[model samples]
Target: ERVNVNLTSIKKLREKVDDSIHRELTDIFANLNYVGVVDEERRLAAIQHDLKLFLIDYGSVCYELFYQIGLTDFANFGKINLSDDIVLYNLLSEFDELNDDASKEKIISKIWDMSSMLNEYYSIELVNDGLDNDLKSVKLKSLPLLLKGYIPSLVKLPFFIYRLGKEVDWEDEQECLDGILREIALLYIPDMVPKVDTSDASLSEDEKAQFINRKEHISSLLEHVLFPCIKRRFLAPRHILKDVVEIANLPDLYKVFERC
Candidate 1:
């Protein structure tokens, strides 16, 4: 009574062995997948969300500091370019403070509300716009480039506050105040123009120059409109020290930034 252990004849036995080995492999993989793959993915998502929240919160903290320094107008300067989006404008109209003082509560809440919108703007809205209008090649990466170029400049306001402080009156400092606001406004103004369709190679040199001129004019006009608005809003009134010299906020802001 020799047993037939051939794979064909011993199908049930093979199935048993197969099932046993499969379970072991699955168990081995389950541990590795959860530890290596799933955990990393979870961590990444957590960092992304946490960092965004912290940036918005710290941004609120920065604005609060401005209020304490009487440059609440700096926050107003930030919003002058915000309502460039009509829908966002209507939404901001719901809270008048957004147009003026930019209180930490309203500004921060609005940022959380706009968080998804900002991500959408970077990931989809801005890219899709040019694509829809003209057959254009859009690099989603450009959004990050735009933000990278712009946001660090915001810290200029905080640094200015550190040096200038609350006792500095706006009327006497009008020239310096207007100059800084105008510089900050330039960061956002150029972006207000439609993204150029660089994909069109057929455009003549004159046409290209015309586009360049138009963007400059648009930025100039925006700054002019926003400059007085930022200046005048301080009439409404509203109300930081450095530790590390230039690294003043490094411990709190940069630590979180790097960890994320």
Candidate 2:
């Protein structure tokens, strides 16, 4: 049996009651999937007392259910990316088509069903990387074209390192790789310029003079050594369907290869 809810009276109650209270009560009825039953006379008279005290504490059978699956820390959720905002905005016009005539089970099921769909799509469409954040913070691509930037230094490198070690031991020249690797490590982890051991008598005056003569080469050496590693990392395939589709609860994303 269908009860004809007086929406006109519901509108009056909506105006008189706190917005928080109306939303909670309406959601409660919607979530219960209820073919709702009430003494309309009693509810209309509820303006006489506090809603919490009257409905939950004294008068009605009380219940509460979460409308969203996750906890309240919406910002911390990886699924709640900024890219989903437009998609979510588009859904507002279509999302609230609640049927007053439906049975309680139907209404609640529909509410949750819509909610789950929205969450699923939000996860699916998240922007995979922050190119803008890279531009803002580094003033460079996180993965950049290395040829123009690093090749000149690399071409001059063997000549520079040959004259760099005046020490009798040839082993100091091999430290070129070591020094280059140290700078590359700082690329991945920022703000860690390595400490220089100035007191060490082992470093020759030739090495200091060569470095002073070619200080710009330091940026080039650092860039050249790091770019191949960065290229390998950035060249890996994107997971286009990671959020949308799962195979046995595991991701199976389609691979794209424009270069291939």
Candidate 3:
């Protein structure tokens, strides 16, 4: 007798396959149905989460090298051809340091802490604002851009930075900081603004050309520029990861970053 096997009913027949395959594919199928459709919100959210984690890996490592390695570090930077999803490469050349009389731990810690602290500003300001307005926004894709354009530019005792930037005398502390931040904001926003003539639907060909141009620019910067910066920066961490299975870290007295 012939059998009717509607492969569409695979989930119903999940029990019949071989032991390991049945066990594995059933779970895979379950997740697929749950997460892998045209408009799955949870699936999209999970992807954004993973992408942000990957960026933390890239950003932390690159900033580590910026402080630790300096210029000669980038001399051999070309040797490694790697890429990340997003990063800031031109900024790599700016954070050069001279290790005249400092311990590696002391030096690296301060640099990493600066990067972390700046993140606090953007986290509270731009990121928080976006999410509060639209919970569905993917902050991950925008975070690196925010970091490159705004956060790293945040000054020590931002109030003072603001006062100095302002032409007027600083009567109020917060005003000073806000003024300076606002100036930087103006410069940065224009660079990132996406300008497209969306009024004409018939200009789809022009839209395609615009997208292609942006993609090529993005690819070059990610693959040629940022990846090498990231690789050099993380040599220290890689050195650590090679030998250690169990790692112990200090719980710093001052807590700042939110745990994801």
lDDT of model 2, residue 71: 14
- The sequence of per-residue lDDT tens digits that candidate 3 reaches over residues 118-167 is 34332222122233323222111222232221233222222222222234
Order the candidates by lDDT, highest first — what do you get? Answer: 3, 1, 2
Candidate 3, poorest ten consecutive residues by summed lDDT: 42-51
lDDT of 2 by residue, 1-260 (tens): 22333434334433332332333333322322111212222211111111221121101211011001111111122321222222211222232443332321232232233333223321222221334322111111111112222222222222222222221132443243233222222222211122334467888887656544443333333334322322222111122111111112112212333435
- Global Cα lDDT for candidate 1: 0.29
lDDT of 3: 0.29
- Writing each residue's lDDT as its tens digit, candidate 1 over 1-260 gives 22232333234423432443333222221222110101111111000111221111112222322222222222212211321232222323454444553342333332333344434322112233343323222212211222212332332332222222222233443444333333333333222234456569977778778777755554443234322232232111111111001212334667566743
RMSD of 1: 29.6
Q: In candidate 3, residue 38 scores what lDDT? A: 16
Q: Stretches of candidate 2 above 4 Å error?
A: 1-146, 152-197, 202-204, 212-216, 220-233, 237-260
Q: Enumerate residue pairs that collide in model 1.
A: 67-239, 68-239
Alpha carbon lDDT at 234, candidate 2: 18
lDDT to native, each model: 0.29, 0.25, 0.29
Instruction: Output the worst ten-in-a-row residue range by lDDT, candidate 2.
Output: 62-71
Q: TM-score for all predictions? A: 0.19, 0.15, 0.22
Reference-based TM-score, model 3: 0.22
Pairs in clash, predicted candidate 3? none
